[PDB]
Each structure stands twice: as structure tokens, then as C-alpha cells.
Amino acid sequence: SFLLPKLTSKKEVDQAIKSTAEKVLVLRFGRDEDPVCLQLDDILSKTSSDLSKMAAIYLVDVDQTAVYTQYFDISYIPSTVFFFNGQHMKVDYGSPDHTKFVGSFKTKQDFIDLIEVIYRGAMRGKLIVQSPIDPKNIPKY
Amino acid sequence: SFLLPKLTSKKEVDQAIKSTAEKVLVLRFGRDEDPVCLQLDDILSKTSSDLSKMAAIYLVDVDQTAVYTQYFDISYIPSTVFFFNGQHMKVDYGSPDHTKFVGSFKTKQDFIDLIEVIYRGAMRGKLIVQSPIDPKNIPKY
Ligand SMILES: OC[C@H]1O[C@@](CO)(O[C@H]2O[C@H](CO)[C@@H](O)[C@H](O)[C@H]2O)[C@@H](O)[C@@H]1O
Questions:
Q1: How far apart are CA B60 and CA B9, in angstroms?
Q2: Which residue has the CA at smallest separation from atom 14 of ligand 1?
Q3: Which residues of B81-112 are buried (b: 16+ CB within 10 A; e: fewer)?
Q4: A24 CA to chain B: closest CA distance, Å?
Q5: Do B128 and A71 lie within an 8 Å CB cutoff?
Q6: Structural domains of chain B, ranges and CATH numbers in brackets
Q7: Is the Cβ pair B10, A68 closer than 8 Å?
Q8: Residue B16 CB neighbour total at 10 angstroms
Q9: Euclidean distance between CA atoms A66 and B51, whole angstroms
Q10: Interchain pair A70, B10: CB under 8 A
Q11: Cα angle vertex B98, ends B96, B104, to 5°?
């Protein structure tokens, strides 16, 4: 894109939501050094060019964006949130929470496939889409 | 007014979310004839005027438009959703779902006190707030 932008404040996330027009805004909430975020971030970086017409991808430091981290109840990282023209786009990936996509992707193409689904739903005026793919597994207690 | 505005299509809801500036937008998803909706609509109507500096209230017909009902995962009516400057507000009532209030308020004052807290927090940039309502007064269902 080439590079992935980093956001480190509530105000920067607000500005990305407000200024990103006609593309899916992808907000990866995480920590750059977290191993699962490192895995996702590599997919994001690699796929970003092929998705540049459909999506603008930003990395967000979960620890520095309290208003958003608390609002989305980010409890496991990475957690990725989607917006389109200032509307929060929800994604049903079979789990009860449609608000954020928790975990990394199996493959780069799975991520592209999700993004296409979001984009084409949002262009049609949809606000919630079903994901054609399932997330990679996040182990819990 | 006493007779709160009705929204009967997705585009009308989209527009109220965009057009309500600097006040809490209150969206009541329900049916005007339903008994619990009648209880809640009486409180919304009777408090609307003295809340008019802090909130704009709308009645959303779930039998004429349904896009938003799926978007907010609404299974039971009434369900009431809060927004501020285009972005959804969460409220922790003491139950797991912070995205919407389900059922009717026990008293006028509970709704007033809630709007006060939502408005002040939203004006300070918050997106999630703590409900002030005593849990004994929160419908359980
Ligand atoms: O993930 C648990 C952690 O989240 C907080 C909010 O930061 O509260 C959430 O989880 C509580 C326990 O499940 C819920 O009862 C509450 O509704 C929810 O917001 C913390 O208080 C909690 O330690």
C-alpha cells in the first residue's frame, strides 16, 4: 500500500472513520509484537495491494485507544472491526458476536474473500454480512 | 412533541442517525400497539419535552423495516438503542448485552437519569457508559 499505517489514539481512529470514503475501513486492534497479531499483520500487509480498491487497512494499538477498546470490549487480540462510510459493518461468522472478527485468518485468500463480501454488501446498502470463511482458532480457558 | 416521530424505512433510520447532532438519539424498535411498547412509549412521550436539550426520540416500526432489527440483533421488542453523532453508544445495565435496552423503564426518572449519563459521557467523547438505574428496576427476561 505499501506500508500499514499505525494509529495510536482515539482521535486518529475517529479521523479514519470520518475520512475513509467508499472503501471498507479495516481496524486491526492489537499489539504489533503479539504473535497472533504478527501472523494477521503479515496477511494484511501481503493482501493489502490486491484489496486497495476495496479496503483501507490500519493497525490500532489497543492499549492507547481506551474509548474504542472499551466500547468494542476487546478481550482477545487481534480483534478486527470494519466500517464503511462511517457506519460500523457487522459480520456474522457463526459466533454470537457480530461486532468484531476475533482471530487471524487461515489464508490470505480467506481475508480477501471476507473483504469482497463486506465491500459488496456495503455498496448495496447492507449493514451486516455473513462471512464466507471461519476465523483461525483463539484458545481460551 | 408528545406524539414522537415515527421512522418506517431503513433510509429514514439512516437519516435520523446522521441528522441528530449533539444530542442523544433514542431509537425505540417496537410496535405501537404492543403492551410493553405502550408502557415504554408513555415514558418516552412524557419525558421527551424536558429531555429535549439532551435527546431526540424516534419510534421505529419493526413491521415496516427490518434491516436495522437484524443489525442490532433484536429478538424482543421493545428494544431501545442509543446513538451520539452517528455512533452507537453502549450502556452497561448489569446484564450481558450493552448494545440495547430491552423492555420498558420502571419509572420516568430512571429514563431521565440514564439519558443524563449517556449525554454527559458522550459529550466527553465516551462510547460506553455505566447505567445509573438500580438493577431491581431493569426488566429481566
Ligand atoms: O472480559 C472481562 C472483563 O470485561 C469487563 C469490561 O472490561 O466487563 C465485561 O465482562 C464482565 C464479566 O463477564 C461482564 O459482566 C460485563 O458486562 C462486561 O462488560 C471487566 O469488568 C471484566 O473483568
A1: 8
A2: B96
A3: bbbbbbbbbbbebeeeebbbbbbbbbeeebbb
A4: 17
A5: yes
A6: 1-141 (3.40.30.10)
A7: no
A8: 18
A9: 29
A10: no
A11: 95
